[PDB]
Structures are given as C-alpha cells and as structure tokens.
C-alpha cells in the first residue's frame, strides 16, 4: 500500500506520495476509501508544507466515502484550494451543498440578527462570494438571477441589477417572483427591501 | 368542528385552485354528510371565477347526494 | 438547477407515497360509510 510512503517521517516522501492522489482519484477508489486514517495523520502533521493540498486530497478521500459535506469541510479548512477548478461536476455538487449551507445560515442569522449569530466562516464566505460572482459574470442573466435567488443573499438582487442588466425584463421577472413565489415575510424582508429600494 | 374545518379551507387554498380537489378526495366522500357539505363549499369558495375543469367534475356526483 | 432536480425527486418520492395514503383513507372512509349504512 502507498499509505506507507505517507507514513514515513520524510516530508519529501510524504509529498511524493500525495502528488498523484488527485490524478488517481478517478480510477482508484477502494484503496483511497480505506486510507482515511493515513490522510488524517497527514492533516494532523501541519508542520509539513503540504497541509493545504493534503486537506484537498482529504476531501478527495471523502469524495470516495460519499461524505460530500465532510469533504466540503476539509477543502474548507484548506481554504484557497477549495476553488482550484471552477468547472467540474464534483465542484458543482460541493458548491450546491455550500450554497444550501449558506442559505440556511443566512436565514437563521437573519431571523435572529441581534448578535450571537453562528460564525460566518471567512473561508466559507470567501468561496461563496467567488462562486455566485462568477455565476453573475458568466453573462447568463436568465439563470444568474435564479441561482442568486437560490443563494438567498440580502444584497444579491441589488448586485444583480447594479451589474450588467442583461435582459432588462429581469426586473419584472424578479418582481413576480417576490409577488407570488416569495411570500413568507420573515425571510422575504431581504428581497422586499431591495425590491422597494429599486422600484 | 368537522363541517367547519372542511368548508373554510378554500379561503387559504384558493391560491392553489388545482389543489382544491386534491385535498378533498376523502372529505367530499366522507361518511359525515356535513363533511361532504363543507368539502363541496370549500371548492366553491376557492374557485370563484375559475374554470377548474376538475373541481366541477368532482362536485358533479355531490349534486345528487341523498342527503339534503 | 441541480438542487432543483434533487428536490423534484424528493417531491416525486413523497407524491408516490401520498397516492395510496389518500386512497387508503378514502377507501376506509367508504368502509365506515358502508357500516354506518
């Protein structure tokens, strides 16, 4: 097993064993699925200069396990390596889960905004901001507003109408969404306050 | 409470006139005639000027129910 | 539109369940109507 190459106390040997994990991730699954203990040792070994990318392949390990949320957290802890590539199906899965997590956290922290909010992770907010920004800059505003509404950000609709207003009927499109679809006033206040300030 | 709770439901559910007949598949045929009466009235209320084409079909058997 | 499809599937799962629960409630209520008759 290649896990021994990571088990050696040589940082260069660890690095060599963990380069190609992101390349054999597609083909080899069982050997990487059983090696959760080894990657935990590498993650704990934070004195080695490849902590971030070890957490990346740690998320790859949890890709094998099927725990997408745990892989999201491990790539979250890596930080800058959460967004290595912006176009893949596993990337789409993890961002969709992260948007759902951001939506739930935003709703509860807006329902109880008088302090004591659940800590909005800088690492999670950083990737979230990057993901819907590019989904707004992809220049497909027939779906950019739709994913923006799914993201459930208080200022995202204001951002959408302040940026390039492709298909200027999007203002009326979002008008009927807030008139008919969005009606639960408790968290609707974000969409409503933006709607009144523009119209 | 039974006849009331099956007639004053179209006030809430008229936003979904397609769901007026779906939530009464047991109320309109219930062994209690008052429950059937409320279910009938509920679809009438929630569909004021709508050609639902489904509430009418489900209300057609109730137009000749033995209970007055 | 992927969480769209996942929620539709979970909508489809429940709707398939709710078909017979309505039918079970309706048929048993008919039985109660029959015994009352």
């Amino acid at each position: 097993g290649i896990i021994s190459l990571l088990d050696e106390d040589e940082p260069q040997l660890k690095e060599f064993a963990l380069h190609k994990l992101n390349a054999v991730v597609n083909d080899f699954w069982a050997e990487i699925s059983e090696s959760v203990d080894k990657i935990e040792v590498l993650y704990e070994d934070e004195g080695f200069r490849s902590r971030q990318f070890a957490a990346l392949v740690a998320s790859k390990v949890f890709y094998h396990l099927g725990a997408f949320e745990e892989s999201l957290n491990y790539a979250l802890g890596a930080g800058d390596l959460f967004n290595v590539n912006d176009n893949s199906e596993y990337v789409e899965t993890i961002i969709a889960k992260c948007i759902d997590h951001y939506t739930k956290q935003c709703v509860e922290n807006a329902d109880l905004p008088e302090g004591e909010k659940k800590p909005i992770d800088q690492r999670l907010e950083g990737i979230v901001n990057k993901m819907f920004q590019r989904c707004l800059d992809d220049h497909k505003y027939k779906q950019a507003i739709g994913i923006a509404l799914e993201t459930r950000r208080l200022d995202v609709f204001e951002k959408t109408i302040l940026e390039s207003n492709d298909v200027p009927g999007m203002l009326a499109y979002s008008l009927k969404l807030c008139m008919s679809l969005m009606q639960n006033k408790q968290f609707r206040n974000k969409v409503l306050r933006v709607l009144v300030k523009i119209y | 409470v039974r006849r009331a709770a099956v007639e004053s439901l179209g006030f809430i559910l008229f936003r979904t006139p397609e769901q007026c007949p779906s939530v009464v598949s047991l109320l309109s045929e219930s062994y209690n005639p008052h429950v059937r009466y409320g279910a009938a009235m509920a679809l009438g209320i929630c569909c004021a000027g709508t050609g639902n084409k489904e509430a009418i079909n489900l209300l057609e058997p109730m137009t000749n129910d033995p209970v007055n | 539109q992927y969480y769209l499809s996942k929620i539709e599937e979970l909508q489809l799962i429940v709707n398939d369940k709710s078909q017979n629960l309505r039918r079970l409630q309706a048929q048993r209520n008919e039985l109660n109507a029959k015994v009352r008759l």
Binding site: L177 | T16, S22 | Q1, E8, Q11, N15, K17, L21, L24
Partner: peptide, 25 residues
C-alpha cells in the same frame, strides 16, 4: 423559478401525505 417552485412543492405534497395519513388511525 423551478428551484423554489419545486421546493415549496415538496413541502405541500409532503404535508398532505402526513395529514391524510393521520386519519387512518
């Protein structure tokens, strides 16, 4: 659009399943 439409849709269908399931007792 269809994202939240299906969201609420799941909620409502789910509700009438359990509510109509409450009468079997």
């Amino acid at each position: 659009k269809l994202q939240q439409e299906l969201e609420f849709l799941e909620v409502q269908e789910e509700y009438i399943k359990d509510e109509q399931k409450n009468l079997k007792k």
